[model samples]
Target: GTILIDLSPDDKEFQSVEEEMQSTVREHRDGGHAGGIFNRYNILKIQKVCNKKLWERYTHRRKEVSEENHNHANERMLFHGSPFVNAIIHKGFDERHAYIGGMFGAGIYFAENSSKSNQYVYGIGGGTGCPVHKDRSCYICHRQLLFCRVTLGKSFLQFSAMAHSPPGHHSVTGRPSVNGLALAEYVIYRGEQAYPEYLITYQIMRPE
Candidate 1:
């Protein structure tokens, strides 16, 4: 079974965990949602996802990509939010979660913008419709977000939909805010190329 290790303020990535929810927000703060309400996330808790076998498997893949460039794998810490918190923690990221015909590709998706990721958190309203398997009319207050290590290796900038990464490209990247996608997105076809490192539980609120 995978376990979660609690993280405190003193942890190196604790502030990062908080700020991941604010990275895009810091730049474009224009009163979140339709109303005057701003999305303020109060982190209830943060934990490290611990799974030895999956961790080792991802690390092995990470090294393979890093060696292609001599040292760095061009990896980055990225964010994602989804309803399958339990499923992902146990089996790692699966392309099946991406559903059918993803705009970029059928792969695990990550975002540099936390707001972009937030929409995928179950129960979040607006653009995200009720997932296919879930019934509508249900909502949850406490939501979860994930921070992960992604091996970009050789990145390919995408302008159109693709079923898989281009030749020699380790991952896919979408350009930012070009009138189609509001935030930068990354897609990796291989699940083992990512490690779901941290999970943050939070709630959204407006200012007092």
Candidate 2:
């Protein structure tokens, strides 16, 4: 078994944007970095951390796609520090660190490795409706990935990257959902530095 965790996105508008991903691509190429381009808000900024090298490669790949399609930019865009990101950065957290914290947990709270300050932002709002999707909902995979990598444990993605599934939880379709065990930690804010605003952790094993 491994750590299973849950995370969310910040912008409420993102809920509606999920269906707009396809058209967003069409507009990107024709407009060229369309300012105020309003694509689906679901795109989290933290996925960039999961694979920096790959992230760069993907950006470069965007150029090719734009050229190949002769003005059709893909729906996905790199992290530009969403409003949630802006808030973290405004509070003075380094860009990289802030991105990771807000992006993973939907900018709901500070998510430093320490769980002392993992405070909740939304506060009992029917739970931050899962920031994940069916086909390519990376929020789930990316959050657990960081938890494993940071907790000094094995990342399901990392292990699976080699052709086989990680140690436990095999799915009939192949992509194994977390079984519910998690590693908890705190997120250090930029200004308050030591005071934790929330508690964040991962569990490969969730409660039945």
Candidate 3:
């Protein structure tokens, strides 16, 4: 069982290539050190706090999903190499964060996380959209739109990477569809930083 939490990306866009380049460069400068150990940071606090808040708000509403429901929902879970990832990253990190820096000709709010475990993924409407196909079909199937990693109790060391969406009349929803929130895949596939196990939990929320 899981509850879909609502988080929003900042509203802003990249005005020029120069602006974005500068932002990206600044991102690298702040946290791009290369030694590659699972560097520690206060992000854990953020995760814990955020999860607790979400649990308080949604735990009662959480519901389980059987494989049949997952399939009936036409849900699709693509990790690395999934085209949908571009949409996820663009909406979450690019449009939401870096783009804001570039567009305002300013800088980022949160320092870049190379591991990306600490990056915030907010609901789509905030600043993301699902990249729909010509037929208006979603690149990835969904039945309770969501994306993120989760751990229960002592399973703290593990992160379950997942993405989902609810069933709807419009099979082809746009990029960053409703309730879509999550960290980029770097935390899952990034060399030593990647967490080995990621379980998909069904989210009980509607895109309002």
Candidate 4:
């Protein structure tokens, strides 16, 4: 049986976990479908091409920054080179739930039709983390507040979106709008791999 380990995001062990996650995503990347919403193959293709540029940019900035400053020069530089950019933009994921290792900018959209048999609600949405003084720093970063999860059961499948804010920007808002397609899926695994079942995928992209 597999056992779980407790490790902070900054730990090298977490990096190994993140790499394994990437391998899983790559293994299943082509297993989903998205008609007109967005092409998974093309989206992945675009991200692959863009990721190289993004990494180069990140490295350049890293070299230019002060040696004492550890914070990334551009946080978004970490979002590319992964299929989960959609999850990050729409889902508002952070380093813990979804780590961004490359650069790409944008929004997310998942359609209800993307599901196989399970029903879902679809719409545009926004989210932001509530900030405060804690842990000797800004305790509540916006990215830290959003998360998403999917689980498979013997006979049922479950999915949930957590800590999402609203659909759009308010008239007198001080928070940045985390708006986008808000819903999309790449696949839904059903049964065994030999007799595998899959569902619709969504169009996730970096804004042009």
Using lDDT as the measure, the top candidate is 1
Find the number of clashing residue pairs for candidate 4: 11
Worst 10 residues of 4 by lDDT: 190-199
lDDT of 3: 0.22
Pick by TM-score: which candidate is best? Answer: 1
Residue-level lDDT of model 2, residues 1-208, one tens digit each, is: 1111223445443333322321222222222121212222233422212233433443454454345444553221111212232243223223244423232221112222111111121112212422443212122422211111111112123111102212331100112134122222222122221111111222111213
Give the per-residue lDDT of model 4 (tens digit) for 24-43.
22211222221112121111
- Badly placed stretches (over 4 Å) of model 2 are 1-51, 77-208
Name the runs in model 4 displaced over 4 angstroms. 1-52, 66-208
Could you give the C-alpha RMSD of every candidate to the true structure, in order shown?
Answer: 4.6, 19.0, 19.5, 21.1
Residues 1-208, candidate 3: write the lDDT tens digits.
2222322222122122112212222121223222111222111000011234334322222222212233232222222212233343223212122223221122221111222211222222112322242111122322111223221111112233221112222111122123134222211101111111111111111113
TM-score ranking, high to low? 1, 2, 3, 4
Per-residue error (Å), model 1, residue 191: 0.5
lDDT for 194 (candidate 4): 10
Query: How many clashes does each candidate structure show, in the order listed?
Result: 0, 32, 16, 11
